[PDB]
Amino acid sequence: RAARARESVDNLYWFMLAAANSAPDTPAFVTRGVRTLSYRELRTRVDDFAAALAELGLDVDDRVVLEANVTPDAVAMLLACSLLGLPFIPVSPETPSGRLRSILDTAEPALFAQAEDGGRADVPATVGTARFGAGGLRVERAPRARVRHRREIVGTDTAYIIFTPKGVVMSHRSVVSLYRAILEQGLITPEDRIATTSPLQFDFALFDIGLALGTGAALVPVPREELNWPRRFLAFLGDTGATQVHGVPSIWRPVLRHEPELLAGLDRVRGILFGGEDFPLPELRHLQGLLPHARIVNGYGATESMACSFTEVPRPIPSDLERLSIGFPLPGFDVSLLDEHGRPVEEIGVAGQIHLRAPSMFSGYWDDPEATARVLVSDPLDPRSGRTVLRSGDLAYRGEDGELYFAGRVDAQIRGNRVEPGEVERRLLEFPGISAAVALLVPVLHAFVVVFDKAKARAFCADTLPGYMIPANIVAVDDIPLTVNGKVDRADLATR
């Protein structure tokens, strides 16, 4: 009685499980005692979860909150939801109770599902509850009764909604279009094992999962408790035979600081992919020199299109390079840089706001048509057609070869001088004893460093940097704090 997506219609289920046919006994997951789960065994688990979910009587478009990190069972659940046209809302179990309640209030999901050993204890009676594990999907409280109205699942149906409360609605057509565009780049092969570090609630995790499974490669989910300690992290990558390591730049900071010798021993690592924020070039040059046979790729873009561009870093990174390129949009993507007059920037080295034409565009912000209209805007180069672009909120400029360079959030840019915090941080990272450095503007410029004479550090900055870029104050901190998704927590540093 439940609708199911047809094989010919864009849908995560069919996209990620195609290798169960062409290579059933190849590994889809490697986990640690190292264990593998084949494509065939993954599809079996998806199909068993989907049979159980289909019993609950949910209509296509009914929302399922999936509280999990990246595991074989969580990926089996999101693929079962996919097949049934039930958009999933991934939430990491580290999400505070109040923030989850805020998501439940706005999203009004039919069902909340967590792992058998999950610890969420406080979900409202209107929301159904279930636990998933080895033993199948187990309903605790059934979702409320309803009538199904949707006969057939389409490509524009919602695959997932990313909540940060801002909810980015992605369609199956959009996410599959991003996977097809990156598969065309041959980043990885079926013999790769992709170590993924991002929380499931971050679309960088959903990118890694669909890249690996769509290619017929293996996914090696790195638990947060392994990632947080440098020798433990390196032993996990070695034991699992990871060939590719994906994550935000911060995943390398402890290893580079405490264990560079053991990092250099990861002889099977063929590639590193980072995204979500700038990689400090002194840290990136350190990593590149420890692993000379790992290709490093810089991934750029936003939840609103999943991503935009994937750009191999130069080998070696020029010692005087100020900014890595974010390259050229993927095939089928296009960028216009518009100035503050709404007009195209063609001039080399002049920043404008990225307006993106993408086949992977979000459907809209959940219950926020006004926010949608400010971001998905009429194409400024073709305003009479009805075609929309993503007004990205990002600045960038082009080089002599048409390649892009990211230039910060439009809304987050001293003495009539634009500060480049990356330039301040670069010069402090080059000061003897400084391991890490983050600069921020309260406008007053403070730097936080992981190690000390502040006065010697200021004069060292003043040797190369203009007056407006010299930090007013330099504060020693034990750690650079991170957001749940692994980005620099500048709001936390502002508090001290």
**Which residues sit at the interface with ligand A1L0H, rule CB under 6 A?**
203-204, 207, 275-278, 298-303, 306-307, 326, 392, 394, 406, 409
Q: What is the CA radius of gyration of the chain?
A: 23
Name the helix (H) or strand (E) containing 494. helix 490-494
- Residue 171 in contact with residue 163, Cβ under 8 Å? no
| Interface with a second copy, residue 335, by CB under 8 A | yes
* Residue closer to ligand A1L0H (CB basis): 300 or 397: 300
* Residue closer to a second copy (CB basis): 88 or 233: 88
Residue 335: name its binding partner from ligand A1L0H, a second copy, none (Cβ under 5 to 8 Å by kind): a second copy
Residue 406: name its binding partner from a second copy, ligand A1L0H, none (Cβ under 5 to 8 Å by kind): ligand A1L0H
- Residue 18 in contact with residue 26, Cβ under 8 Å? no
Task: Give the whole-angstrom CA distance, residue 49 versus residue 139.
Answer: 11
Please, what is the minimum distance in Å from the beta carbon of residue 300 to ligand A1L0H?
4
275 closest CA partner among 299, 294, 251: 299
- Tokens at 105, concatenated: 């209030």
Show the site string, 214-253: x = touches a second copy by CB under 8 A, - = not: ----------------------------------------
Part in contact with a second copy (CB under 8 A); list of ranges 43-51, 90-98, 120-128, 332-340: 332-340
Please, what is the minimum distance in Å from the beta carbon of residue 484 to ligand A1L0H?
11
Residue 188: name its binding partner from a second copy, ligand A1L0H, none (Cβ under 5 to 8 Å by kind): none
For residue 47, the Cα-to-chain-centroid distance in whole angstroms is 27
* Residue closer to a second copy (CB basis): 6 or 409: 6
Please, what is the minimum distance in Å from the beta carbon of residue 467 to a second copy?
39
Tokens 């046209």 map to which residue?
Answer: 85
Tokens 């930090």 map to which residue?
Answer: 471
Part in contact with a second copy (CB under 8 A); list of ranges 191-199, 267-275, 294-302, 360-368: 360-368
| Interface with a second copy, residue 61, by CB under 8 A | yes
Task: Give the whole-angstrom CA distance, residue 102 versus residue 233.
Answer: 33
| Interface with a second copy, residue 385, by CB under 8 A | yes
Q: For the residues of 112-163, what is the DSSP string, one character each?
A: EEEETT-------TTSEEEEEETTEEEEEEPPPP------S--TTSEEEEEE
Q: How many residues bind a second copy (CB under 8 A)?
A: 54
Q: Which residues contact 494 (CB under 8 A, 6 or more apart)?
A: 440, 442
Sheet holding 473-476, edge to edge: 436-441, 445-450, 473-476
CA dihedral 32, 35, 38, 41 (to 10 degrees): -100
Residue 394: name its binding partner from ligand A1L0H, a second copy, none (Cβ under 5 to 8 Å by kind): ligand A1L0H
| Interface with a second copy, residue 333, by CB under 8 A | yes
The interface with a second copy within residues 8-47 (CB under 8 A) comprises 8-10
Tokens 């074989």 map to which residue?
Answer: 72
Q: Which amino acid is at 197?
A: T
| Interface with a second copy, residue 435, by CB under 8 A | no
Tokens 């949707």 map to which residue?
Answer: 150
Q: Give the largest CA-CA distance in the chain.
A: 73
| Interface with a second copy, residue 391, by CB under 8 A | no
Residue 150: name its binding partner from a second copy, ligand A1L0H, none (Cβ under 5 to 8 Å by kind): a second copy
Contact residues toward a second copy (CB under 8 A) are 6, 8-10, 59, 61, 147, 149-158, 169, 171, 173, 177, 180-181, 184, 329, 331-336, 344, 346, 357-359, 361-367, 369, 372, 378-379, 381-382, 384-387, 402
